[PDB]
Amino acid sequence: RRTPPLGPMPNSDIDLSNLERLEKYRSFDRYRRRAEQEAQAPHWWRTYREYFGEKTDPKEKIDIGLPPPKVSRTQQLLERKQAIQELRANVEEERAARLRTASVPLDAVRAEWERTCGPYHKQRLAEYYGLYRDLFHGATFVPRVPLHVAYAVGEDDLMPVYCGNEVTPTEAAQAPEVTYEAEEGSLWTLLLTSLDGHLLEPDAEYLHWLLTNIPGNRVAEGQVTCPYLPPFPARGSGIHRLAFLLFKQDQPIDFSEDARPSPCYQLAQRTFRTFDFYKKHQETMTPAGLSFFQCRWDDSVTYIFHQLLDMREPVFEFVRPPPYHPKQKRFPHRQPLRYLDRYRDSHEPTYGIY
Amino acid sequence: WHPGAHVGVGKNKCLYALEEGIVRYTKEVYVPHPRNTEAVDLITRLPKGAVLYKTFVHVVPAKPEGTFKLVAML
């Protein structure tokens, strides 16, 4: 029996009567390019994508954030052409390019990159680690405003904080310095949250470093509702990603639901839901910045368990499921002598009635 | 058939699962290694705009790798 094809089968638009005049696959690289763009395209038949590909809804994610400024593409393109034409006109780049001795300042490229198109890439990184799906249950934004944070270790050196960095708790035991490039008249807000830090329930976040009503870049007079307490990544719990996020407070708002006393290290008070928190307080403002890092267990984590948090430290551990074995059969055949050892519980011997 | 999604291959061209779960069959594109000359030169003879497919078995991992369990509250 045969059935017609539901959709248009491949290699159908082509014609077989004309075969020699057609242009051939010159190289392996041309084939895989055709194969790859074919793969990203959809197909009606059952494929690898519809089994192990996240099940994103067809509707685009909602993001009422800061739109881009209206840059004049005409003048912007002309200024770009002014830069490359004088670059090619220079004399020293010819030798340096063809002798392979040139380089580039990394931090300078980083500085101009994060101002030009960084927030789109940081948005891409955010959804990869799962910041948006865990925070807003899918809704996204674009952190247009840059954001730099550092942990002052001693006085000479410091640990930076950017998207996807590891941070030690010993260096994160104090408060960090923050800069977010705003002089801009109105207020701002900042908060530090841990997504997977909670242990009693999923989709619950803690809060370690909250500041509100910060006029301008200066951070000192910004009042704190939730005072500082470092995180506590337990041994064996794995890795916990700590998230910076920042909003554009257009006008001052009170904090009654959110107001907390002197720190007192009560996780029942520290825990809440960012989803409902955004729906109540943040209807006047919108996201402006974002960053995050990762933390792990260390000696200072053990210190705060016994001394600061006033509780016993937990000790988790990853346990795999047991190795599967089939149902026993009292007369095996063509199996090694250790068929019994695969099912015996006690490795030691024992004698029943003697 | 051809492997995929935690399905190894023996020297006698037999397919075998590597993870515990459900088996699935699909059809995807086939790109050989450069050392497979008979398959490499084949796709060069093909015309651009046309692509060949092949069957692929796929095992869906049912359970996760494990679970984090409390060992001691000290």
Binding site: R2, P5, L16 | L42, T55
Partner: peptide, 19 residues
């Protein structure tokens, strides 16, 4: 499989030169 609409998707000999 033959009865299914996906039949004839993997065949490739009808493109290349026959010899």
């Amino acid at each position: 499989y033959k009865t299914k609409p996906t039949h004839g998707i993997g065949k490739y000999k009808h493109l290349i030169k026959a010899e």
